[PDB]
């Protein structure tokens, strides 16, 4: 998955809270962690959840309201989904 590694375009988000996956479908993260999100066009519709990667390889669901969306970032190859990410 090129969005997860940052090879493809992705959205960047910062974790607000700690989260432990309860299910195989979810991924764990710590408060302050930076995650890559799939673009709108690759996002599944699961109410309360977004598709993300913490480690660049595994992907899974995170609670949408546990992260702040920071903006879209170009691959190496609620309105913040549009703005570009400025580190």
Residue numbers in the entry: 265 to 341, 354 to 363
From the publication, what sentences describe this entry?
Import of proteins into peroxisomes depends on PEX5, PEX13 and PEX14. By combining biochemical methods and structural biology, we show that the C-terminal SH3 domain of PEX13 mediates intramolecular interactions with a proximal FxxxF motif. The SH3 domain also binds WxxxF peptide motifs in the import receptor PEX5, demonstrating evolutionary conservation of such interactions from yeast to human. Strikingly, intramolecular interaction of the PEX13 FxxxF motif regulates binding of PEX5 WxxxF/Y motifs to the PEX13 SH3 domain.
Our results demonstrate that the PEX13 SH3 domain indeed binds to WxxxF/Y motifs in PEX5 and that this interaction is conserved from yeast to human. Notably, the PEX5 WxxxF and FxxxF binding sites overlap and are thus competitive. The PEX5 W4 motif was identified as the strongest binder followed by W2 and W3. Of note, amongst the eight motifs in PEX5, W4 shows the highest relative binding affinity for PEX13 SH3 and the weakest interaction with the PEX14 NTD. To investigate the structural basis for the PEX5 W4 / PEX13 SH3 interaction, we determined the crystal structure of a PEX13 SH3 GS W4 chimera. In contrast to the PEX13 FxxxF motif, the binding interface is limited to the core motif driven by hydrophobic interactions and few hydrogen bonds from R183, Y185, and Y188 to the backbone or K304 sidechain. Nevertheless, polar backbone interactions involving G335 and K336 and coordination from K304 seem important since they are conserved from PEX13 FxxxF to PEX5 W4 (colored lines). Our crystal structure of PEX13 SH3 with the W4 motif reports high-resolution details for this non-canonical binding interface of an SH3 domain fold.
